[PDB]
Amino acid sequence: MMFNFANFYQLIAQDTRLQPWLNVLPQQLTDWQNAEHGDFPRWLKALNKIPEGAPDQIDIKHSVTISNDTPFHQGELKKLESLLRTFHPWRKGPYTVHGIHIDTEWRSDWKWDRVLPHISPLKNRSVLDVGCGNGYHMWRMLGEGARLCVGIDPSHLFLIQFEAIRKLMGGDQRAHLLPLGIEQLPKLEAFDTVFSMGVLYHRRSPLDHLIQLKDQLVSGGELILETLVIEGDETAVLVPKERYAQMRNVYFFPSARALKVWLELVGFEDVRIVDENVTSVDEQRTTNWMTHNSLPDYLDQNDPSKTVEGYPAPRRAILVAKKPGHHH
Amino acid sequence: MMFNFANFYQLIAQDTRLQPWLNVLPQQLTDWQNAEHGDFPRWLKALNKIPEGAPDQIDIKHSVTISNDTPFHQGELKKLESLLRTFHPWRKGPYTVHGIHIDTEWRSDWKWDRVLPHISPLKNRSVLDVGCGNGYHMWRMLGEGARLCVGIDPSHLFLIQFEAIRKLMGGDQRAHLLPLGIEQLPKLEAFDTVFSMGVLYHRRSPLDHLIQLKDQLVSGGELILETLVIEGDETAVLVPKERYAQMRNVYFFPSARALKVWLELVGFEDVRIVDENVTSVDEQRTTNWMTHNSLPDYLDQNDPSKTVEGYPAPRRAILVAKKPGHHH
């Protein structure tokens, strides 16, 4: 037993649309326990010595900020910062935790500000975040009144980062991160909203990815798809021979207009391209909480409009779509 | 969805030894829901009409009796009696519920009085009742201070009877009836005590039945085995060509002395034959709550020492045994 999912099993037991998940999830999490991870024991030892207990003040509306009305013990703060730095690299955020600023590789707040204006309100929505990272966006979703956020990300580190923030939130049961890939879910059709941001290009079968997302939505449910694109029309689709911006094992980089046709082909409606953004080195860079290489190292050193391999430089698109039917 | 097992899923989620059961149980219960039963909708409509409150007084020590301090509405009592009579036939009890006497085919209290003197105290024990009927003996086990009783019986009706009594008990979560056969359980090794009373003769493989029971016990756990026997030494074993006392699909009726050797062969220790009882027509008979044929109709009408088919008449034996190891 690396990590006990008792609390999640309890939650989906008591939910008429997620209870069917109990037919496959428990054996998958049993298997995940037995594939020992080198670092997980160390990570857990550090997670366990993070302070337990509810903070006085939580902002998950405008940021992800935790504080106490009481200034914290100087020495307990120094320990906490050291524990959180154990979970390097911190890629998604930022977080402000009792005045500790976790300056993540990504300004994940900026992507959130690009998405929020275009989505159906999250008030009392159940949400699936596919490839949620450490779950930054799930906190922002609860900030907007979401009833339940389930994240899936196969990274052991991001489950520990998520549980660190969730413990510092006082053990909030309205968000959960499951160490799965999207390919491991059955057809649940349980969620009002599904996010898939930064996942499509990692999937060998892009149309199967779009069908797997459609299969998690209630009828009239909403998809937010975010992915790396190129410029062009409905037949502009980059598939790199080698790496794209130093990423291994990436596949399809369609144009936003191609992706819209793809979403229509698999049976989404009201498909809208709502945002295209050329990723600046201020949205993604090396920081003191993520000391590895980042976007500046992945660009042509003489031409920021190209990756080091010669392809057009990272461009992220947001599409919003509806699964057919009325939303009940 | 005939019946939602949400509350049982929640319980085993939070239990270190039963959580592994989530790896097979939910699909089995999903399959059970989809094998529609003719009567279950009617039964459920009646179960849902039974009053929802906690009663003021419960005796599960000396009987199974429920009452209120303030006498019930005269008309609400007549309705309750009608709802409970919906669940005909009532084979196992008796029960007294707000002065309504459920006069069951069996005096299940009499078997309980024969068993109780020979068992390890149930205080704080987790118990499995294999072939529990409507759960009569599970209430008596909670009466003796059992922490947890899980019953398994594949009868749809007995699940409805159990849930009727459990609702009238105020929704007591310390007992549960799962609509399974013992062959559907994985090796849990989770229970301090296991009861198998009246099951062994129904099982084609008696030694597999005994191993299945052993597989639900913690180290040093206690088995209570009760079954129909014949008289004789370690090599006396009736297997009827015909029916036995009108029962179809029955197999092994060993002597109590043979059954002791059987338990020893499969690896039980301290095996004790503690009681043999020739079933009288006062223990099992037709009543107003079970109007079908019963033991008097199954006996030779000229010789009550024989079944209608000519075999020795029903004789029940109780054996108690320990699974190897020290009991922690």
Next chain:
Amino acid sequence: MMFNFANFYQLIAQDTRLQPWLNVLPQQLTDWQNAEHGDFPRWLKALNKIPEGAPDQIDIKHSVTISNDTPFHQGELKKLESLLRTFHPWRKGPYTVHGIHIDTEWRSDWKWDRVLPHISPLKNRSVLDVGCGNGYHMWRMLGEGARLCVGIDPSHLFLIQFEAIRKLMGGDQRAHLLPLGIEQLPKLEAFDTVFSMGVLYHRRSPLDHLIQLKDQLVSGGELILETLVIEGDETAVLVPKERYAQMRNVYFFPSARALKVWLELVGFEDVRIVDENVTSVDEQRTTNWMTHNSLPDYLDQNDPSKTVEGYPAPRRAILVAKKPGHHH
């Protein structure tokens, strides 16, 4: 039992690289037998009436032509023509059988002439033809000295057409048609050459299709990939919203240059674009042996450079590639 695969089971039993196929194939063919097809009984009755002997003369080098030295009974020839016409529609050929000319929708000989100059000699090669139709090209592969041809096509009719020709060939055991999709094959790595001609656009996951092909090749084995393309560079990929040339359930129409990158990404080497051909209405048309609609009906009736839907008109490309390693 629609059709007994006894002879194929016998063949792979005695073959060191294909025997492992017996671990999944027989259940798949058992399942296929039990999904009754409306027409198969009629087809079989006609197949069984086709003469059983070996013919005196076979040309599978320059065409697929069968004849006898002594002219056939005038009346037996009229019966044979009637039996073969039972298997309408005849899409792939042509065939000449005892002077009966099967004028197929497709001039499959023309594709064969475009392919043959670019392939490694087939002498003593084992070959997989993926989506083989009635097996026309497998006869041409045996013509070129292939040791073994295994075809897979999920069409019931094309299995009957193949078995009709194979019976008229004298029951030649060097070619076989299995009623499977490529997704049903395990990783065999058993074949010197693999053909996939006209399949890729039908597959939702094009890169999975290419890996499935790679998984049937011995080390250093050769792939012949033929498919519908569009014009353009490495980022030209049509995915139609609509039908393409009246076809339902089609997906990816990359450029030949894009397809070369795709084959390189999934790990093929020495990838060569060897031919592009704009399909003329002389290559594919309605005939007396295939009386349904064909390419002329699928083209814009005012502009043969476009499909009826407005996309560029059918253009077929041939690519040849090697699986990594030396070919033993």
Next chain:
Amino acid sequence: MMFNFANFYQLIAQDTRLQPWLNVLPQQLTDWQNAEHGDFPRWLKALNKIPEGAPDQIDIKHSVTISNDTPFHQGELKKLESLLRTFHPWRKGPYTVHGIHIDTEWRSDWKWDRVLPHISPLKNRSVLDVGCGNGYHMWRMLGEGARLCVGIDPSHLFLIQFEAIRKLMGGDQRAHLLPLGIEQLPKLEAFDTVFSMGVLYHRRSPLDHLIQLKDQLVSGGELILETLVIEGDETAVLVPKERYAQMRNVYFFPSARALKVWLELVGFEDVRIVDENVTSVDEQRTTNWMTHNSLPDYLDQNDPSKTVEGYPAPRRAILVAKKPGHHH
């Protein structure tokens, strides 16, 4: 690959009643290959240097005797005897192989003479020998005109002994030994006759064993059941606490009369008890080809009517029964 079952797969491919076995057998034999056996490599090296080629003379009617019209090379005979002695212990026989007398622990010929008078003639019958040992009785079955004998025995040594005799028979394809237990067969209903001799007492579930035998028979098919019994009526059934005659992991020793009721309960007809034999120390003993302990060591040294443990001494019964239906 310990042993290649190519020839068996070929045979059941071409048999309409055994072909369905290909749905499960190949994965089971693949798994059996990968459970490496310490001795199998050595055994195989010795099997491979046994002379290949047909003998001139075979008696499988009155014994199992192989000879050449030509007396054999003195030195080749010395090598052969040494190779065959590699496969110690030789429990079932005897065999006479080019004048080499393999004096087996058991006089298996004597059991054959007790069985033969009572069975339906084997001429053109397909036969299953369940727990066939090295396949001695399958040779005697072919001697009586059996068309096909399939043996199953999970002992790696007995498969090597069988292949040694089968190679010395010239590679006779009418008999085969599969390294399986009876529990691994699906319901084939393929065999005219089934033998189960010396197996029932090794099976934890005796009634499941009798059903598994019934499941291998064509309708109107014949069972020969042979097993260790006690004396007594329909309720005489020994189940030993410990060992019986030094055997570990044995279960039910019913009387012949009990076993007859058991066969009727599971649905056999025309059940006849045809022979009971108290095993003499001349039927089973230590020999120069089986140097381990044997029946004399397993008996009370002062009372040959008892096993060393005190139970009645070995008594073997033969029952013959019919599966319901007419035999087509």
